[PDB]
């Protein structure tokens, strides 16, 4: 499996396990559900170096989230 942590700005951590087969979209769609503002626009980036993923179809193995990783949350 693959462990994806979301670090929120206001010292909030969300630890969610995933499958390496599952796409990026699924997690983004999960985050939309989890957050109380889906309508509000947000972007998930991984640093360092500062970079965001525009691809939702990109798999986690290919993305380099192996086995686990942490990604920051920004709006």
């Amino acid at each position: 499996k693959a462990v994806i942590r979301v670090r929120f700005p206001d010292n909030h951590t969300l630890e969610a396990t995933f499958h390496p087969s599952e796409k990026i979209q699924g997690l983004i769609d999960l985050v939309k559900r989890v957050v109380a503002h889906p309508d509000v626009p947000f972007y998930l980036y991984t640093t360092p170096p500062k970079k965001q993923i525009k691809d939702f179809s990109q798999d986690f193995y290919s993305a380099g989230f192996v086995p686990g990783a942490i990604v920051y949350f920004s709006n």
Partner: protein, 439 residues
Amino acid sequence: PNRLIVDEAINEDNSVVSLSQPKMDELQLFRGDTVLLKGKKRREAVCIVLSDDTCSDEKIRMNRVVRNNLRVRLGDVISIQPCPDVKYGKRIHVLPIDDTVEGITGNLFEVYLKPYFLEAYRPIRKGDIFLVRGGMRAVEFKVVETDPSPYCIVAPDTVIHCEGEPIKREDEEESLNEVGYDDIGGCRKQLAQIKEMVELPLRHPALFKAIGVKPPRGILLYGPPGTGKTLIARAVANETGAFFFLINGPEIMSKLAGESESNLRKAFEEAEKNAPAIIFIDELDAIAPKREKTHGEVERRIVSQLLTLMDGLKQRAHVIVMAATNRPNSIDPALRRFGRFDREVDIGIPDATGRLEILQIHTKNMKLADDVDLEQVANETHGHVGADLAALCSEAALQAIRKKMDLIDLEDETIDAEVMNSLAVTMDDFRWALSQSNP
């Protein structure tokens, strides 16, 4: 095992390290997690672990900054501890280094920290040294004090105070301005082979002392001028923490007859005193021509003196001599001896990938436009040497300044760093610089 050996990093960052997937799986280390690094002289460092397939389990890849912060070099062992618990920075106090700010007055916080730190969330500790690149240079910075202790993570809410008071450089703390392995580009196989030959001796003189096998006393570096042999030799010495003395053929030739020998003798004696040290000959060809080429009796005495010094060099001395020659044809037969310069290194012309690699190293401090492509420029140069590329970059920079800065002509007395920051080099500048090529 927590114990690992420092290695060269592929990624070019302050706080980025590289380990093997299994090692991370063994110690349950996550890609973004922050690892604590324990070095020598009771110094500790904080970094961001990363997953690299290429990296071997037993080796860790890290930059010259953390090594210097940890006071460690290549062939030294460090200890990594996971640091799950980490709290954000509340307040930070940093003062720049006198030698980095030289010839720059004005508000540099806005043009160094803001650009460098842009939701980077880099971990830092009180008294840590980090490098920021801006205004076409590399400016080192120190952490004076932090409200959170001992270490913290940089946050955009967190206030960073910067005062225009330099701190006096500390002789224990070597600067990053020095030449490094990362600064050498366009040679892979050549560098690796050179590295390991001198790795063994310089790091462990006591091993070589307690072993029958003798380390190579003399190393010879081939290739045309402008390739960069001095730069190769210099970096190694600094990286290996060995005393480096440079001998210039003209400088030795300039000195009058009878003193030349004295200067050479003095240099060799000095190396023994500060052993283990590295001696490098720049213009060997000038010092020692071929036997048919030399027509001076005094010249022959100088050559003889060098040969006597080379023979004189012992194992106990632990001094490595590195010589550079342009062409093999113009070599004294006597120099090509097992006793003396047994070891010979052939430097071929850098390949297109190597030429591209060189361009990246020269342009790392300066600000490049999106339209500018190094690869295309690298493709256009076939027989251009490392030096030629540097000259092209220099000429391209000057042209870019002439094209923009000359029109404003606001450069009166003190020049603000921020103005220099706004300046970017256009692709056309490089094309204009490339056009004017003639050796």
